[PDB]
Amino acid sequence: IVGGYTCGANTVPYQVSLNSGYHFCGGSLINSQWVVSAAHCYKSGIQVRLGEDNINVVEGNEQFISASKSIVHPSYNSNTLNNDIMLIKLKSAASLNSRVASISLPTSCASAGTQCLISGWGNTKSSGTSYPDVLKCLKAPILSDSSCKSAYPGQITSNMFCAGYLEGGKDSCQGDSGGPVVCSGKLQGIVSWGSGCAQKNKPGVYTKVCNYVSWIKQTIASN
């Protein structure tokens, strides 16, 4: 997160870190046994780390649980990043309390102008590299489909939305990928892509979760 703020320990209780020896992506806890993340975060050997603030210190609220199964969206295209979503099932159910909690799925899509909270352990510099230990947060609005397409001609599908600031300075970044965009208490986005970080006229691009709720629910129901 570039241009954000320190969230506060466990104030984002659905935020997870995907660990393969090191943090490599975020995710969102959507029930006691399932995490949603970005398909471009797929790899084998994932350990889901819940209840994290400092990802380099054991502070007392962590739950570390191995993935038992990963499911990349059937129609994920790694070239275009269309359908950049994946589900991860936990080998055991997480214990849910106020510091570790699932985030509600949307029943309807969000609109341009809604403010949302975006969070993660990604890079904090736009012309630099600095990775935080503690969870960073950014409040950002959803942008219009037309400004999204204008920023990124020929690249924005119906399964993507832009959020952030056209002026630059405030964005998600490398290492936030897979993490949440939460708007009015619903998971509306997944950190997916963008040209650089926090560049002018290059907002963040997010997977549009509301298009996937039927797939998410049926997948959970059969796995």
Binding-site residue positions for substrate: 171-172, 174-175, 177
- Compute the least distance from the CB of residue 69 to Ca ion, in Å: 25
Q: Is 17 helix (H, G, I), strand (E, B) or coil?
A: strand
Active site residues: 40, 84, 177
Question: To which residue do tokens 């736009």 refer?
Answer: 126
Q: Which residues are annotated as a binding site?
A: 52, 54, 57, 62, 171-172, 174-175, 177
d(CA 153, CA 37): 25
Query: Which are the contacts of 218, defined by CB distance < 8 A and separation ≥ 6?
Result: none
- Compute the least distance from the CB of residue 48 to Ca ion, in Å: 13
Token pair, residue 173, equals: 């970044």
The residue (of 52 and 176) whose beta carbon lies closer to Ca ion is 52
Q: φ and ψ at 213, to 5 degrees?
A: -65, -35
Contact 191, 172 (CB under 8 A): yes
d(CA 91, CA 9): 25
DSSP 8-state class, residue 212: G
The residue (of 55 and 103) whose beta carbon lies closer to Ca ion is 55
The binding site for Ca ion (CB under 5 A) comprises 52, 54, 59
- Compute the least distance from the CB of residue 34 to Ca ion, in Å: 22
Q: Which residues are annotated as a binding site for Ca(2+)?
A: 52, 54, 57, 62
Q: From residue 15, give the alpha-carbon distance in Å to each of 27, 134, 216.
A: 6, 12, 18
What would you report as the CA-atom Rg of the chain, rounded to the nearest whole angstrom? 16
- Compute the least distance from the CB of residue 57 to Ca ion, in Å: 5
The residue (of 58 and 221) whose beta carbon lies closer to Ca ion is 58
